[PDB]
Amino acid sequence: DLGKKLLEAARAGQDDEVRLLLEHGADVNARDYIGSTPLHLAAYYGHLEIVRLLLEHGADVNARDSTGTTPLHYAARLGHLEIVRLLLEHGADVNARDAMGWTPLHLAAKKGHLEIVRLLLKHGADVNANDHFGKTAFDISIDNGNEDLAEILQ
């Protein structure tokens, strides 16, 4: 159906094809078999323009897949700064927790993405949020010995 096509196009970074499918009425929140939406896949693969088009056509900014992962979780983990920025501006839940209890801040902390960390903090990320391991993003920075991040967070 059109939603399957939309999922594939979003994943592939096909700006024009996504716009075409949306204009022919593809379900903007179509789900794959793990509950990914197109916005998840665009966030994962770093397709800014596609995230923009999807939001414009009423994509759920706070969709969760079957594991509780949101698009912002992917963008934060995979280092896509400008996707983090756009998602945040469209109302992404800065403190969403995935199945492990990780917020975007935790995930950006794990991968050492300093500008994402700072941007998350500007938009109200909870520096005291504990994951299911009992760790804050600051604990993670101390466990990775990432001085720059620990300095930002401490």
Side-chain angles (χ1 to χ4, degrees):
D1 87 304
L2 292 169
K4 292 150 147 211
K5 306 247 212 96
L6 187 59
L7 286 155
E8 288 165 357
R11 183 185 305 122
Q14 296 166 346
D15 298 338
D16 291 307
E17 179 65 5
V18 165
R19 190 191 283 284
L20 163 53
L21 296 160
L22 290 170
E23 287 165 4
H24 244 85
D27 179 0
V28 71
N29 303 309
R31 304 280 177 159
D32 80 359
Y33 81 102
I34 71 161
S36 313
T37 63
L39 186 64
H40 286 267
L41 300 184
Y44 190 100
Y45 289 112
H47 306 309
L48 185 64
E49 180 71 0
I50 291 165
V51 166
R52 196 198 67 77
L53 287 165
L54 295 164
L55 294 164
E56 171 182 344
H57 282 82
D60 182 359
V61 75
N62 289 318
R64 265 78 176 178
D65 79 353
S66 67
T67 66
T69 293
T70 69
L72 182 63
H73 284 115
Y74 286 146
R77 182 182 65 198
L78 279 284
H80 300 128
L81 176 65
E82 298 303 322
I83 295 175
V84 167
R85 192 190 314 283
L86 186 58
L87 284 174
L88 286 168
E89 294 169 351
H90 279 76
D93 180 355
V94 75
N95 294 314
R97 270 80 165 178
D98 73 8
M100 308 306 293
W102 292 320
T103 66
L105 186 78
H106 288 93
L107 301 175
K110 290 151 55 69
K111 303 290 283 286
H113 302 316
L114 304 179
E115 292 295 339
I116 286 168
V117 167
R118 290 179 173 104
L119 180 66
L120 291 166
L121 290 165
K122 297 189 168 45
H123 280 78
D126 183 355
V127 79
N128 298 314
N130 287 125
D131 62 27
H132 287 307
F133 298 89
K135 304 288 195 195
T136 64
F138 178 66
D139 295 322
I140 292 174
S141 76
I142 299 304
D143 295 347
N144 293 165
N146 183 329
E147 272 203 283
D148 289 346
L149 211 204
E151 183 60 39
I152 289 156
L153 301 162
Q154 90 193 305

